[PDB]
Design a protein around this nucleic acid. Structure first.
Ligand code: ZN
Lengths: 492, 19, 750, 730
RNA sequence: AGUAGUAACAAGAGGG
RNA sequence: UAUACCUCUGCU
C-alpha cells in the first residue's frame, strides 16, 4: 500500500469485467406505463379505534369548556336527553365471537352507570367481560426444558399479512372527512399580543385558517382521537388492574355560538400492565350509530352490532322514527399508538403550511397579501376530486380540509404499508413530474420500483385507497397529455 | 369569516340527529 | 364527488406539494419481539453477495471467514462485494493528487488528538456492548467495567489517563488465557421475623475464568437488535452495536475520516442541512460554469443498495494505510486496528425466539445460543433454512461475519470511498466525451453528469456504475433515476431550480419533548422558530403551532391556566398561586400563567421574557438556587437534551434554571434482576464525587487531571485552604488544629 | 469555615466501602466513575413523560425536600414520599411540590440574575427597544451563508474564554497558565465586578459565560442584513414572500456600517453609469437612500471611509474625500491611483509569520512631515520611485526609511534580524517593522540594492553608506531640493484636469450587506441585490406584456430605451452590452421580417438586453453572460436555462428558482417549425437532416453561402438544420 | 376473542 | 393441583 502507484488499474479491470454489468437508461414516458395492481381477497374492514362517519351523538347544551366537568357526569347528562331505549337484540353477529357476551357487556355497563356513585366507574370482572377484554389469554410462561417435548409447540405465526380488496367505504369515509360542519371542534389557546405588522398579517390569515380547520369534519376526528388516547393512556398507567369505563366525549361550540357536550358511546379499558411500547391494552368500544350494518356487512367484520333503541328524529318536513344501533367490538392499542393519537393536532400544521405556502407563493408574484382574495373570491381553484362529469376543482378552503383529512387519515390508519407505499410511490410521482417539466427522465429498473410500491399494498383500507388515488391521478395525467411528440404538458 | 361549501344534506344529520 | 388529494399534482408540481406524500403524523413502524430473524437475514445476505470469495478458518477464533476482495469480477447487476484492492488505491491516490497536503494535515490533526485524548472521552457516547455482562450498557458504565476487569488482571497502563494506553491494554489482553470475570447469581435464604420464617432472595457474585477463545470472541462481538420507528419502509431491519474493545480504535479512525471529509467539497458529512444544500448548490454552479453551451447535463437522483453489507473491512485497511502513507508506523498500526477487528468481527444473534403451544396454552423463550443444539421441528420453513445456513458460521453462540458491515458500526470512512469515485470524474482524469461531479453522504448520492450528447451521458453512467462495482458499491437501479439537470432529490431535500421546503419531514418534532417543564418550553418555541427560517413554516401556521404547543404542554404537565374550571391533581395548588399573585402575567405557563409568545418572542426564554412582570417573592422562589428539584450536573451537560432527526445528536436549549428544571424518576426494573447492586455502586460513586466537588469546585466545569488519589487530593486541599483561612482571614487557631488532626486521623486509616 | 466538609470525609472514610473507592480510584479515573450508571438515555422522552405525568410521584428530588416543604399541603395533596429514586438518595415527589415551593417556599435574592444570564436578557433588550417598519411582499432570495448567532460576543478562543471563566468563578484553581491578552484582563475585571455577591450555582455562571464570550456560527439562509443582531431575528424579518422591516435596539458597529456604506455606494454608482444623466441619478439616490434607517448623506458627512464608489458620492455632494492619513509622523496624501486591501501572512528574515494588511495597485502620494517631504510612487510590495527633499540629510534619510518600510517590499522583510516586539498598548504590525528599522538599518540598506542613474541636474542618489552619489542610488530613491471636480458622467478630476477616480474602475465585487439598505428610489427596484433585478425586470415585462408587445411591433426604439431595463444592464458586462444589443435587435427584426415565426417567450427573454446603443458587429452567441453575486451565469439564447426557464406544466417563467409570473395561455399553443431570433442571418428549420452534410459548430457558420442549408450544434446537445437567409435584417 | 404483522402482546418475576 | 391473598416491576 505504501509503495503502490496507479497504472491504469481501474481501466484494466473495467476492460476485463462483463458488459452484462451496466446501468441501461430506459426512457420514461407516463403514457406508456401501467396502473398499479391492487390485490384480491375478502374486502378490507374498518380498523379505526372509533366510528368516523357512522358515529352518532347524544348531546346537551352546556357552557362547560373543552375539558371541564367530570366525564361520567357529562356522560349521564347526555344519556338523560334520550328516551326510547329497548331490550337489546343482536342485529349483526361478530362471526368469530361469543355474541351473548357483547349483549351482556352492554347490559352490565348500562346498569353499572345507573348504580355509580362517584367520579370514576370500575366494572366487576364478570365472565362475559373477562372474555371481551382478553383475561388470561396469554399462554403461561415456562422454561423450555419443562415444555421441550410438546408436539404442537411451534414458533409464533410469523407470516406476511393476509391480502384484502379495496372496499368502497374508505373513499366514502374520506369524502365526509373533507366536509364542513356546523360546529367549531377545536379551541385554540391564547397568543401574546400582535405588535409586529407581520404578526397582525399572520393573525388575519390565521382567522381564515382557524374557522376552516376547526369546522372541518376531520377536526372532530382529531378531538375524538386526542380524548380517547389521552383517557386510555392516563387510565392505563394509574388503574392497571381495574376495568375502568371511559365515556367517549367531545365538546364543541356551534356557529350559532352555544357550547355543547357530545356523547358518542363508551370504552371499557381492559388490564393494562404495559411494559414495552408495543404492549397491548385490550378494550371494548360500545358506540352509538344510525347506520344499518347489513347494507355493508363486510365493513364490520370485527363488530357485533346490537339494536338498543328507537329515536324520533326531527326534520324540516316531519318527524321520522329510526332504529338506534350500538356498534360493539373488542379492540386494542399500545403506548406508542396512544402517544401519537394524543398528538393528532399536528395534522392541522401539515395541511395549513401547504395551504399557506400556496398562498404565499402567489403573494410573492402579485407582491401583495393574497390571503383575502383566496378565501373570499373563487378564481384560484385546484383539482381535488373526480365525479362522473369529470375532474372537479375546489377553493383554497376545500384544499385545506382535503389535505387536513389526508393527514388525519394517515394518523388514524398508520401502518408500515403506508410508510413503504408513500416512500416508493414518491419516486414514481417525481418521475412523472420530471417528464412533465420536459426534463427527459430515465429509469434503470422500472419493474423493480413498481414491485417495491406494490409489495406494500397488502390489506390496509387507507393504503389501498391511496394506491387507487395514484391510478386515478395517472389516468388524469394521461388524458390531459394524450398522443403526440409535442403534447399538452399544461393541465387546464 | 364563515367558511362554506357547495353541498347539502336536505333531511337530517345521522351524526347529529335532531331529537 | 370522490375526493382525491393526489389530483392537486395536476396543477401544483410534486416538489411544491411534497408534504402531502409524507405521512409523518401517524405512529411509525415498530418491531415486536426479537431481531434474530433479521440478524440472520443480514448475515446470510452479506455472505451471498460475497459468495464467490475465499473461505479460511481463523487461527485464533476458529471462525469461518469469507474474503471476497480481489475476487471474481461480477457478471450481473445483483449486489456484489467483490471490491478490488488496486482499484480502491487508485481512487484514494486520485484523491491525494486532487487535494495535496489534505492527507498530511488530516493525519497530523489526528496525531495531535491521539496524544491529547484521555480515557474520559469514551464516557461520551451512546449504548455500547459490554463483554463483561454480554449485554448493552451505557458508554461510561461499559468503560468502567472493562477498566475494572483489566485492573483485576495485569493491565493498568490506562492508569496514566491517556487513551492510547487503554488501547495498548486492549491489545495486550488478547494474550491472556484465563481472563477472570465476576458474574452475579441469585440465592434463596431464610430469616426469622416476629414469629414466622420468610424466604429472602439475595444476590452473590461468582468468579469465572474464560478461555482464550471465549474472551477473544467477546471482544470482537458486536450486539444486534431491530431498528424501531424507521419511516419509509415496509420491513424492519437489524442494527449493530460495537463493543468496548473496538470502540476506542473506531474513535480515532472516524476522527481521521472526519478531518478528511471536513475539507472535501464533495462530502455531505459531517455538515448540517443548510450547508449540505449550499454544497449541492456549489457543484451545480461549478458544473454549469465549467461546461460549454453545446454540452448537456443530467442529474442522477441516487441510492446505493445494500450499502453496509458490501463495504469490506479489508478495503478499509487499504484506505487507512494509503491515507496514512509516510506517517509514523505506530500511528498507522493504531488506526489499522479497527478495520482488523471489523474483518474478524462476530455478530450476536439477539434474544432468540418464542415458541407457542395452542392446545396446552403455554409459551417459552429459547436463547439464540440454543440455535446450534436444537431440533428444527419447532421453526417455520424460512426460519429453519436460515438456522441451517447460520450453523456453518456459528462460533460460541455468535455468527461469524468477516465480510461486509452493519448499521451502527462505522460512519464516515465509507463516504470517502464514494467521494473518491466522484473525484475520478474530473475532465483531466477521464479525458473523454463525458465528465461528472456530485455530492455524497453514506449510501445517498447526487451525481451530475455532463457530456456533448445523450449517448455520452449513458457512457458516463456506465463508467461511474462499473467503477462503483469495482470497489463494492452497488447503485440501486430500482430506487435511483436520471433526468436533465434542474430537479433532483438528496436525503429528502428536494431541488427544483433551487431547494424547496419539506416541512412534513419535521412534523414529529412539533410536540412536548418530554425533558421537563423548563426545557420543553424552550425546545418547543425554538422548533417553531427554526422551521420558520429553514423549512418555510408561514407566519399564520407558526402562530397556530405556538397555540397548539401551549395546549399540549398544558395538558401533558397538568399546568393549565390558574383561572380555568378544569380539575386535575395540580389545579388547586396552581389556583392558590394564581389568587395570591398580584401580577398574573409574570407567572410561567408551568405555574398557571399566560402564554407570552407570538412570532417576535420565540428566541427569548420564558423566565427572561416574564422577569420584569414577576412578583418578587414568586421570582425569588422560582429561581431559588438552594432548591431540591434541580440536579446540579456538569457544565458540559447543562441545558442539553437528546433528539433524533443521522444517529442521535444532542440538542442545546436556552433556559433559566428554575424549580421547573427537574428530572423525572428513573426506571426501576433493575431491582428485580441480578444487576440490582449496580444501583448501590452508583449511589456510592456519586457520594464520593459529591464530596470531592466541595474540595474541588472546578471539577464540575473542567475535569481535573492527576494520577494521585481522590482522598490524597482532598486531604492536600483541606490543609492548604485551612492554612490560608487562618494565616489571612476569618478562622480561629483552635479550628486549624481541629482540621489538621482530622487530616492526620484520615491518613491513619490508609 | 470548611469544618463540616472534612468532618463528613472522616465519616465517609469510616465506611469501609467508600474508603476503598476514595483510595483506589485516581483523579483522572474519577471522571469515569462519575458517569457510571444503570440509567439508559431515554429513546422516547415524549412518550415517557406522558406516561409518567399520569403517575402520582414522577419527579425525583433531593432528600432534604422532606425538611423544607410539608408532607401534605392545605388541600391534602401528598407532596413527597420516602421512596428512593433508583441509584441515588433522591426521593420521589409530586408536581404539587414544585407548585407549593413557587407559592409558599423560601424566598431568595436573585436581582443580579440578569447579569449572569446576560446573553438572554440582551435579546429582550434589543427586541423591547426595536422599531418596526412596514411589510413589503416580494420574492425573497436567500443565500445560504455561515453567519454569527451570538450577538455581543467578546471574541476569544475556547481556551482563552476558559481562562477568563476560571478567573471569575474558580479563582483559586487556575492552572499554570495566566491571562495573556488585555482583552482577557478587562473582561475579567468587568465580570468579577458585575457578578460579585450573586447567590447562584457557579456551574450556571461558568455555562452562561462560555455561551456569551465564545463566537458561534451556523449555516442559515439570510436575505439582507447578515450581522449578528439581524441574524437573531430571521424568523421575524423574512418569510418566503415577505420582508418585515425592523431595526433592532442599540447602535450598529462601525465595521458593519463601513462595509454596508461601501456596498450602498457601489450599487449607486453601478446604477448611475447606465442612465442618461448619471450625476442627477446618483444625487437622487443619495438623498433617498438610508442605511440602518439613518440617511445616506449624513453618513457620508461623518464617515471617513476611503473607497472609489464612496468618494464619487462624496465628490458629487461636495464633501471632502478622506484622501490622507499619517504614518511615522509624516502626512501621506494620495494624488493618483487607489488603495485595494488584502490581509495576508508573510515570513520575515527570522522566519516569523505575521499577518499584514498589505496594499495593492499603483498609487502616488505627496508625502510631507517635520522638516522633509517626498513624492512616492508605489505598487504591490514595490517602491517604484521616491523623490525626497528636506532641511537636513538625517531628515531626508529618516523619511526615506519610513517610505522603504511603507513600500512593503520583500527586500526589507527578509532583511529583518530577530523577533519583533514593541509596546501597555501594543501597536499594529507596520510600526513593528518601522521601529525595528528606525533603531538599526544596517542590513536593510545592504540588502535593498543599488541602481545606476543618468546624471540629471538637481537630482542625486543616496548610497547604503550614507554618501551622496550622482550616478548611483538605492533602488527607487532619488534626492532633490487639493480641490476636486466631478462632471456629468461621474469622472472625478483635480484642478489640473487629470483623472483621480473613474466609475468604470469601481470594484465589481458585490458581497452581502451587514446592515439593511433601503434605496427609497424609483431608479431602483423594491429589493436589494442582483437576483431581485432579474426577477423584477422579467415580472414587469409579463405584467405589462400586452402594452409592450404592441410597442414591440409598432415603435421598438422606444421599447428598447425603456428606463425599467436600466438595472438589468448593470448585470451585463460593460464591454458586452453593445454587441448583445446588436445581436438582440437583429434577432428581433428577423422575427418581424420572417412572417409566421413569432415567439412571445423568446422576445420576453431577450428584451432587457436591447437597452443599450447597439454595435454593428457580426459575432454569434449561444448565450448572454450575466454577473450575479460575483459568479458569471449564462442565459442561453435557445430554450430554457437556470436564469430563464419557461415551465409548460405550471405555465410560469421561473427566474433563478422563483416564479416570476404566468404568461398568457395563448403562448402554450404558439409555435412554428421554423425558429427565427436564434442566429444572426440564419433560420432554424427543424430536425438535423444528414442529407445536408456533417455537423458544423456555430463559429464555422461563415463557410455557408447565401441560401445554403446545414446541420449545426446549436446548444444543449441538440443538433439542428439551419439555412442562411438571403436578405439581412435592420 | 382482539391487537397486530415476518413476532410478539393478550402481565412478567417472587412469596416454592 | 386449585382458589384467595401479599411483595417488586411498567424503556433495563
Ligand atoms: Zn388549555
Amino acid at each position: 500500500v505504501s509503495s503502490f502507484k496507479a497504472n491504469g488499474n481501474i481501466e484494466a479491470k473495467l476492460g476485463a469485467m462483463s458488459e452484462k454489468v451496466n446501468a441501461q437508461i430506459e426512457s420514461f414516458d407516463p403514457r406508456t406505463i401501467r396502473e398499479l395492481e391492487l390485490p384480491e381477497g375478502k374486502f378490507c374492514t374498518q380498523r379505526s379505534k372509533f366510528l368516523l362517519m357512522d358515529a352518532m351523538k347524544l348531546s346537551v347544551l352546556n357552557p362547560a369548556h373543552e375539558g371541564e366537568g367530570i366525564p361520567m357526569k357529562d356522560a349521564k347528562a347526555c344519556l338523560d336527553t334520550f328516551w326510547g331505549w329497548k331490550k337489546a337484540t343482536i342485529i349483526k353477529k361478530h362471526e368469530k365471537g361469543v355474541n351473548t357476551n357483547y349483549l351482556m357487556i352492554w347490559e352490565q355497563l348500562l346498569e353499572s352507570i345507573k348504580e355509580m356513585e362517584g367520579k370514576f366507574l370500575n366494572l366487576k370482572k364478570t365472565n362475559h367481560l373477562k372474555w371481551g377484554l382478553g383475561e388470561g389469554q396469554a399462554p403461561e410462561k415456562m422454561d423450555f426444558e419443562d415444555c421441550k417435548e410438546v408436539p404442537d409447540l411451534f414458533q409464533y405465526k410469523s407470516e406476511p399479512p393476509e391480502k384484502r380488496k379495496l372496499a368502497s367505504w374508505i373513499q366514502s369515509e374520506f369524502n365526509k372527512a373533507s366536509e364542513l360542519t356546523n360546529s367549531n371542534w377545536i379551541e385554540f389557546d391564547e397568543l401574546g399580543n400582535d405588535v409586529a405588522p407581520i404578526e397582525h398579517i399572520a393573525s388575519r390569515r390565521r382567522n381564515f385558517f382557524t374557522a376552516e380547520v376547526s369546522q372541518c369534519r376531520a377536526s372532530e376526528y382529531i378531538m375524538k382521537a386526542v380524548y380517547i388516547n389521552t383517557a386510555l393512556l392516563n387510565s392505563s398507567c394509574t388503574a392497571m388492574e381495574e376495568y375502568q369505563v371511559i365515556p367517549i366525549i367531545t365538546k364543541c361550540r356551534d356557529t350559532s355560538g352555544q357550547r355543547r357536550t357530545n356523547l358518542y358511546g363508551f370504552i371499557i379499558k381492559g388490564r393494562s400492565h404495559l411494559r414495552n411500547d408495543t404492549d397491548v391494552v385490550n378494550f371494548i368500544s360500545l358506540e352509538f350509530s344510525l347506520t344499518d350494518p347489513r347494507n355493508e356487512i363486510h365493513k364490520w367484520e370485527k363488530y357485533c352490532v346490537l339494536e338498543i333503541g328507537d329515536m324520533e328524529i326531527r326534520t324540516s318536513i316531519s318527524t321520522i322514527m329510526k332504529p338506534v344501533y350500538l356498534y360493539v367490538r373488542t379492540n386494542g392499542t399500545s403506548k406508542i399508538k396512544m402517544k401519537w393519537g394524543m398528538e393528532m393536532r399536528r395534522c392541522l400544521l401539515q395541511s395549513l403550511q401547504q395551504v399557506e405556502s400556496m398562498i404565499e407563493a402567489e403573494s410573492a408574484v402579485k407582491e401583495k397579501d393574497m390571503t383575502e382574495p383566496f378565501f373570499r373570491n373563487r378564481e384560484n381553484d385546484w383539482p381535488i376530486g373526480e365525479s362522473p362529469q369529470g375532474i372537479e376543482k375546489g377553493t383554497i378552503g376545500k384544499v385545506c380540509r382535503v389535505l387536513l383529512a389526508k393527514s388525519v387519515f394517515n394518523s388514524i390508519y398508520a401502518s408500515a404499508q403506508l410508510e413503504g407505499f408513500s416512500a416508493e410511490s414518491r419516486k414514481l410521482l417525481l418521475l412523472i413530474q420530471a417528464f412533465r417539466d420536459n426534463l427527459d427522465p430515465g429509469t434503470f429498473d422500472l419493474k423493480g420500483l413498481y414491485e417495491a410500491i406494490e409489495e406494500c399494498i397488502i390489506n390496509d383500507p387507507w393504503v389501498l385507497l391511496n394506491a387507487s388515488w395514484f391510478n386515478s391521478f395517472l389516468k388524469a395525467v394521461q388524458l390531459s397529455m394524450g398522443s403526440g411528440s409535442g403534447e399538452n404538458l399544461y393541465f387546464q | 369569516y364563515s367558511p362554506t361549501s357547495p353541498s347539502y344534506s336536505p333531511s337530517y344529520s345521522p351524526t347529529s340527529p335532531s331529537y | 364527488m370522490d375526493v382525491n388529494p393526489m389530483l392537486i399534482f395536476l396543477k401544483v408540481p410534486v416538489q411544491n406539494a411534497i408534504s402531502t406524500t409524507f405521512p409523518y403524523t401517524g405512529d411509525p413502524p415498530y418491531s415486536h419481539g426479537t431481531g434474530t430473524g433479521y440478524t440472520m437475514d443480514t448475515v446470510i445476505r452479506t455472505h451471498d453477495y460475497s459468495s464467490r470469495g475465499i473461505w479460511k478458518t481463523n487461527s485464533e477464533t476458529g471462525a469461518q471467514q469469507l474474503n471476497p476482495i480481489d475476487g471474481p469480477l461480477p457478471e450481473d447487476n445483483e449486489p456484489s462485494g467483490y471490491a478490488q484492492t488496486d482499484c480502491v488505491l487508485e481512487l484514494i491516490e486520485g484523491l491525494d493528487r486532487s487535494h495535496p497536503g489534505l492527507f498530511e494535515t488530516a493525519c497530523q490533526e489526528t496525531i495531535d488528538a491521539i496524544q491529547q485524548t484521555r480515557v474520559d472521552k469514551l464516557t461520551q457516547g451512546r449504548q455500547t456492548y459490554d463483554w463483561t455482562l454480554n449485554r448493552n450498557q451505557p458508554a461510561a458504565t461499559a468503560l468502567a467495567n472493562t477498566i475494572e476487569v483489566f485492573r483485576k488482571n495485569g493491565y493498568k497502563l490506562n492508569e496514566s489517563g491517556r487513551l492510547i494506553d487503554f488501547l495498548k491494554d486492549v491489545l495486550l489482553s488478547f494474550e491472556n488465557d484465563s481472563m477472570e470475570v465476576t458474574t452475579h447469581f441469585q440465592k434463596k435464604k431464610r430469616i426469622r421475623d416476629n414469629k414466622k420464617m420468610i424466604t429472602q432472595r439475595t444476590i452473590g457474585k461468582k468468579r469465572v475464568k474464560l478461555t482464550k477463545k471465549n474472551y477473544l470472541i467477546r471482544a470482537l462481538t458486536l450486539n444486534t437488535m431491530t431498528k424501531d420507528a424507521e419511516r419509509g419502509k415496509l420491513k424492519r431491519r437489524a442494527i449493530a452495536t460495537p463493543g468496548m474493545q473496538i470502540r476506542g480504535f473506531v474513535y480515532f479512525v472516524e476522527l481521521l475520516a472526519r478531518n478528511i471529509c471536513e475539507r472535501l467539497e464533495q462530502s455531505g458529512l459531517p455538515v448540517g442541512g443548510n450547508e449540505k444544500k449550499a454544497k449541492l448548490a456549489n457543484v451545480i454552479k461549478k458544473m454549469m460554469a465549467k461546461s460549454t453551451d453545446e454540452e448537456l447535463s443530467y442529474t442522477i437522483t441516487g441510492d446505493n443498495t445494500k450499502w453496509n453489507e458490501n463495504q469490506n473491512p479489508r478495503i478499509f485497511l487499504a484506505m487507512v494505510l494509503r491515507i496514512t502513507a509516510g506517517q509514523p508506523e505506530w500511528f498507522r498500526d493504531l488506526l489499522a486496528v479497527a478495520p482488523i477487528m471489523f474483518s474478524n468481527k462476530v455478530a450476536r444473534l439477539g434474544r432468540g425466539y418464542m415458541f407457542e403451544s395452542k392446545s396446552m396454552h403455554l409459551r417459552t423463550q429459547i436463547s439464540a445460543e440454543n440455535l446450534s443444539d436444537i431440533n428444527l421441528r419447532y421453526f417455520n420453513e424460512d426460519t429453519k433454512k436460515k438456522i441451517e445456513k447460520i450453523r456453518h458460521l456459528m462460533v460460541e453462540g455468535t455468527a461469524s461475519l468477516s465480510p461486509g458491515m452493519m448499521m451502527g458500526m462505522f460512519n464516515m470512512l465509507s463516504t470517502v470511498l464514494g467521494v473518491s469515485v466522484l473525484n475520478l470524474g474530473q475532465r483531466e482524469i477521464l479525458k473523454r466525451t463525458y465528465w461528472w461531479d456530485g455530492l455524497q453522504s453514506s449510501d445517498d448520492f447526487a451525481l451530475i453528469i455532463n457530456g456533448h450528447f445523450k449517448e455520452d451521458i449513458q457512457q458516463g453512467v456506465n463508467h461511474f456504475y462499473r467503477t462503483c462495482k469495482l470497489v463494492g458499491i452497488n447503485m440501486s437501479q430500482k430506487k435511483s433515476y436520471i433526468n436533465k439537470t434542474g430537479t433532483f432529490e438528496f436525503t429528502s431535500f428536494f431541488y427544483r431550480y433551487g431547494f424547496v421546503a419539506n416541512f412534513s419531514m419535521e412534523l414529529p418534532s412539533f410536540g412536548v419533548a418530554g425533558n421537563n417543564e423548563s426545557a420543553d418550553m424552550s425546545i418547543g418555541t425554538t422548533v417553531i422558530k427554526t422551521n420558520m427560517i429553514n423549512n418555510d413554516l408561514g407566519p399564520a401556521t407558526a402562530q397556530m403551532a405556538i397555540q397548539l404547543f401551549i395546549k399540549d404542554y398544558r395538558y401533558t404537565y397538568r399546568c393549565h391556566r390558574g383561572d380555568t374550571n378544569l380539575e386535575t391533581r395540580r389545579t388547586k395548588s396552581i389556583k392558590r398561586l394564581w389568587t395570591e399573585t398580584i401580577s398574573k402575567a409574570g407567572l410561567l405557563v408551568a405555574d398557571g400563567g399566560p402564554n407570552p409568545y407570538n412570532l417576535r418572542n420565540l428566541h427569548i426564554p420564558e423566565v427572561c421574557l416574564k422577569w420584569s412582570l414577576m412578583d418578587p417573592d414568586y421570582r425569588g422562589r422560582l429561581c431559588n438556587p438552594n432548591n431540591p428539584f434541580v440536579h446540579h450536573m456538569e457544565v458540559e451537560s447543562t441545558n442539553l437534551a437528546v433528539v433524533m432527526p443521522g444517529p442521535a445528536k444532542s440538542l442545546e436549549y436556552d433556559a433559566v434554571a428554575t424549580t421547573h428544571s427537574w428530572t423525572p424518576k428513573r426506571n426501576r426494573s433493575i431491582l428485580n434482576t441480578n444487576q440490582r447492586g449496580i444501583l448501590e455502586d452508583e449511589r456510592i460513586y456519586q457520594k464520593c464525587c459529591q464530596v470531592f466537588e466541595k474540595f474541588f469546585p472546578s471539577s464540575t466545569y473542567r475535569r481535573p487531571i492527576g494520577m494521585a488519589s481522590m482522598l490524597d487530593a482532598m486531604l492536600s486541599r483541606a490543609r492548604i485552604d485551612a492554612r490560608i483561612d487562618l494565616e489571612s482571614g476569618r478562622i480561629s487557631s483552635q479550628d486549624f488544629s481541629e482540621i489538621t488532626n482530622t487530616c492526620k486521623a484520615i491518613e491513619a486509616l490508609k | 469555615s470548611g469544618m463540616e466538609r472534612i468532618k463528613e470525609l472522616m465519616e465517609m472514610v469510616k465506611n469501609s466501602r467508600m474508603r476503598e473507592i476514595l483510595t483506589t480510584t485516581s483523579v483522572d479515573h474519577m471522571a469515569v466513575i462519575k458517569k457510571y450508571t444503570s440509567g439508559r438515555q431515554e429513546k422516547n422522552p415524549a412518550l415517557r413523560m406522558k406516561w409518567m405525568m399520569a403517575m402520582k410521584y414522577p419527579i425525583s428530588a433531593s432528600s432534604r425536600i422532606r425538611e423544607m416543604i410539608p408532607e401534605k399541603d392545605e388541600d391534602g395533596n401528598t407532596l413527597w414520599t420516602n421512596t428512593k429514586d433508583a441509584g441515588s438518595n433522591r426521593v420521589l415527589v409530586s408536581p404539587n411540590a414544585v407548585t407549593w415551593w413557587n407559592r409558599a417556599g423560601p424566598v431568595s435574592d436573585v436581582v443580579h440574575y440578569p447579569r449572569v444570564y446576560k446573553m438572554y436578557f440582551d435579546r429582550l433588550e434589543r427586541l423591547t427597544h426595536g422599531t418596526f417598519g412596514p411589510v413589503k411582499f416580494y420574492n425573497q432570495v436567500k443565500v445560504r451563508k455561515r453567519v454569527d448567532i451570538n450577538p455581543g460576543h467578546k471574541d476569544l478562543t475556547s481556551r482563552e474564554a476558559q481562562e477568563v471563566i476560571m478567573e471569575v468563578v474558580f479563582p483559586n484553581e487556575v492552572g499554570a497558565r495566566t491571562l495573556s491578552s488585555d482583552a482577557q484582563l478587562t473582561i475579567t475585571k468587568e465580570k468579577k465586578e458585575e457578578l460579585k455577591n450573586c447567590k447562584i450555582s457557579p456551574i450556571m455562571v461558568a455555562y452562561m459565560l462560555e455561551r456569551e464570550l465564545v463566537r458561534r456560527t451556523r449555516f442559515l439562509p439570510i436575505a439582507g442584513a447578515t450581522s449578528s443582531t439581524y441574524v437573531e431575528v430571521l424568523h421575524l424579518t423574512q418569510g418566503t414572500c415577505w420582508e418585515q422591516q425592523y431595526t433592532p435596539g442599540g447602535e450598529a458597529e462601525n465595521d458593519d456600517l463601513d462595509q454596508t456604506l461601501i456596498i450602498a455606494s457601489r450599487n449607486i454608482v453601478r446604477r448611475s453609469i447606465v442612465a442618461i444623466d448619471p450625476l442627477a441619478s446618483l444625487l437622487s439616490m443619495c438623498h433617498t437612500t438610508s442605511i440602518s434607517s439613518e440617511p445616506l448623506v449624513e453618513i457620508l458627512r461623518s464617515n471617513p471611509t476611503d473607497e472609489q464608489a464612496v468618494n464619487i458620492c462624496k465628490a458629487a455632494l461636495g464633501i471632502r474625500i478622506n484622501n490622507s492619513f499619517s504614518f511615522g509622523g509624516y502626512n501621506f496624501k494620495r494624488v493618483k491611483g487607489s488603495s485595494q486591501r488584502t490581509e495576508k501572512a508573510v515570513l520575515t528574515g527570522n522566519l516569523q509569520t505575521l499577518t499584514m494588511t498589505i496594499f495593492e495597485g499603483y498609487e502616488e502620494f505627496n508625502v510631507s512631515g517635520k522638516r522633509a517631504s517626498a513624492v512616492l510612487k508605489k505598487g504591490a510590495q514595490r517602491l517604484i520611485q521616491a523623490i525626497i527633499g528636506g532641511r537636513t540629510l538625517e531628515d531626508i534619510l529618516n523619511l526615506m526609511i519610513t517610505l522603504m518600510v511603507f513600500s512593503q517590499e520583500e527586500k526589507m522583510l527578509k532583511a529583518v534580524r530577530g523577533d519583533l516586539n514593541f509596546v501597555n498598548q501594543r501597536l499594529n504590525p507596520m510600526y513593528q517593522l518601522l521601529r525595528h528599522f528606525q533603531k538599526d538599518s544596517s542590513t536593510l540598506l545592504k540588502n535593498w540594492g543599488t541602481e545606476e542613474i543618468d546624471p540629471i541636474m538637481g537630482i542625486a542618489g543616496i548610497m547604503p553608506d550614507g554618501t551622496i552619489n550622482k550616478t548611483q542610488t538605492l533602488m527607487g530613491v532619488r534626492l532633490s531640493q487639493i480641490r476636486v471636480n466631478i462632471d456629468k458622467y461621474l469622472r472625478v478630476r483635480n484642478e489640473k484636469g487629470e483623472l483621480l477616480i473613474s466609475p468604470e474602475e469601481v470594484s465589481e465585487a458585490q458581497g452581502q450587506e451587514k446592515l439593511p439598505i433601503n434605496y427609497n428610489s424609483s431608479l431602483m427596484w423594491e429589493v436589494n441585490g442582483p437576483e431581485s433585478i432579474l426577477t423584477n425586470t422579467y415580472h414587469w415585462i409579463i405584467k405589462n406584456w400586452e402594452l409592450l408587445k404592441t410597442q414591440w411591433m409598432t415603435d421598438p426604439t422606444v421599447l428598447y430605451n425603456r428606463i425599467e431595463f436600466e438595472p438589468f444592464q448593470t448585470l451585463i458586462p460593460k464591454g458586452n452590452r453593445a454587441i448583445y444589443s446588436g445581436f438582440t435587435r437583429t434577432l428581433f427584426q428577423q422575427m418581424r421580417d420572417v412572417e409566421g415565426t413569432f415567439d412571445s417567450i423568446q422576445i420576453i427573454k431577450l428584451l432587457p438586453f436591447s437597452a443599450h446603443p447597439p454595435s454593428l458587429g457580426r459575432t454569434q452567441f449561444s448565450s448572454f453572460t450575466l454577473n450575479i453575486r460575483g459568479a458569471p451565469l449564462r442565459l442561453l439564447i435557445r430554450g430554457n436555462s437556470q436564469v430563464f426557464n419557461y415551465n409548460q406544466m405550471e405555465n410560469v417563467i421561473i427566474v433563478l428558482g422563483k416564479s416570476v409570473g404566468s404568461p398568457e395561455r395563448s403562448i402554450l399553443t404558439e409555435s412554428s417549425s421554423i425558429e427565427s431570433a436564434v442566429l444572426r442571418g440564419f433560420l432554424i428549420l427543424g430536425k438535423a437532416n444528414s442529407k445536408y452534410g456533417p455537423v458544423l459548430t456555430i463559429g464555422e457558420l461563415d463557410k455557408l453561402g447565401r441560401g445554403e442549408k446545414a446541420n449545426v450544434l446549436i446548444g444543449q446537445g441538440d443538433t439542428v438544420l439551419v439555412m442562411k437567409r438571403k436578405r439581412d435584417s435592420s
